[PDB]
Structure formats: C-alpha cells, structure tokens
Amino acid sequence: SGLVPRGSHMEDFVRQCFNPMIVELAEKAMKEYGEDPKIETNKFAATCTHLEVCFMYSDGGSKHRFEIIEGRDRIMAWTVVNSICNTTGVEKPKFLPDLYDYKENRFIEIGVTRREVHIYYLEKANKIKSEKTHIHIFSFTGEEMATKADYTLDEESRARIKTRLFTIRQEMASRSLWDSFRQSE
Numbered sequence: 001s002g003l004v005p006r007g008s009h010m011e012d013f014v015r016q017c018f019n020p021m022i023v024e025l026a027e028k029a030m031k032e033y034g035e036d037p038k039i040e041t042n043k044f045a046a047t048c049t050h051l052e053v054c055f056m057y058s059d060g061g062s063k064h065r066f067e068i069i070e071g072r073d074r075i076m077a078w079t080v081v082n083s084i085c086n087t088t089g090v091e092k093p094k095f096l097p098d099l100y101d102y103k104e105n106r107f108i109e110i111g112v113t114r115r116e117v118h119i120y121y122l123e124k125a126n127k128i129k130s131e132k133t134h135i136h137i138f139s140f141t142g143e144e145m146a147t148k149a150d151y152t153l154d155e156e157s158r159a160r161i162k163t164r165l166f167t168i169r170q171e172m173a174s175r176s177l178w179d180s181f182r183q184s185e
C-alpha cells in the first residue's frame with residue numbers, strides 16, 4: 001500500500017457515477033493493458049464513459065442490429081471480429097473497433113472527446129486509415145460527428161447519449177474534478 005492508493009476522489013466518483021458492471025469492465029480493460037484504475041483515475045473515468053456510451057449506442061436500434069466488440073477481453077474481441085469478417089466478407093480492421101452494424105455491414109469506432117469533435121475524428125480517421133470502418137465521435141459539450149454524415153442511430157438515441165455526457169461533466173465540475181479531467185486528454 002505504498003505507491004498504490006486506498007482511494008481517490010475521482011475513483012469514488014466513478015464508482016457512484018457509473019453502473020457497477022461498467023466499472024468492473026473498465027477495471028478489466030485497464031488491467032489487461034498494465035494500467036491501474038486507482039492511480040490513473042482520469043483514464044478510469046474515460047474508459048467508463050466510453051464503455052457506457054458504447055452500450056447506450058448498441059441499445060439504440062433493433063434487437064439484433066449491433067455486435068458489441070468493446071467490453072470483451074482483447075482475445076475474445078478479436079475472435080468475434082474474425083467471425084464477422086469471415087461471415088460478411090468485410091475487411092479485417094487493423095485496430096479493434098467498438099461495434100459491428102449488421103444493418104449497415106460495417107464496424108463502428110465510437111469516440112468520446114473533451115475537445116472539439118473535429119480534432120478527435122481527424123486523429124481516429126488517420127489512425128485507422130481504412131475508409132470502411134465507420135467513425136462516430138461524441139463530445140462532453142453535445143456535438144457529434146460521424147463518417148459521411150451518417151449518424152447510424154435515430155436522433156433520440158443520440159440525444160440520450162449527449163445528455164448523459166453533459167450530466168457526467170456537470171457531476172465532475174461540482175466536485176472540482178472536471179478541469180483535471182478535461183486537461184488529461
């Protein structure tokens with residue numbers, strides 16, 4: 001119990017802000033990549049936020065529309081990706097995406113930003129390069145930006161995500177945690 005703390009204000013906020021299972025998946029995703037949520041608390045909240053947005057995103061639309069890639073361990077996620085590619089014929093993406101759209105026949109990369117959605121997508125579009133994987137960026141301010149202006153979901157489903165994102169921002173600010181969270185990206 002030396003360099004590893006017993007608790008943090010951000011960690012306690014993450015646990016009361018997000019559903020317990022979302023917190024567990026974020027802990028597993030971080031520990032799989034050698035990161036401890038008890039110290040890097042800003043990344044802990046961001047992974048939780050990205051997880052919840054991904055699950056809300058898949059909750060929009062029909063029952064069998066989306067195959068959820070995020071939230072699984074790396075090996076299982078790449079296994080499902082291989083099955084989707086070897087079933088639909090879609091090219092294997094270089095980087096692990098977040099979802100697959102059975103309706104649109106494309107993988108989706110979900111992004112949640114604390115800057116303008118313009119820089120983030122411009123980053124993610126240049127990282128994945130492949131103009132076949134769909135990109136959908138959400139901001140804590142309420143904007144969004146998707147590939148070919150195709151926002152996939154209904155307006156109501158996307159507005160729910162933007163509303164939740166702004167609520168997380170307000171809850172952090174009332175705890176004086178937002179500025180360090182914003183400056184961490």
Ligand SMILES: COc1cc(CCNC(=O)c2nc(-c3ccccc3F)[nH]c(=O)c2O)ccn1
Nearest residue numbers: 029030033043046047050096097098110111112
């Ligand atoms: C540093 O890299 C990782 C990766 C993992 C597991 C897989 N995570 C992603 O693939 C994935 N990650 C992120 C994100 C990463 C760090 C901070 C805030 C984020 F929002 N955004 C995505 O959009 C996104 O898809 C856990 C911790 N750190």
Ligand SMILES: [Mn+2]
Nearest residue numbers: 070096097098
């Ligand atoms: Mn991901």
Ligand SMILES: [Mn+2]
Nearest residue numbers: 098109110111
């Ligand atoms: Mn993502």
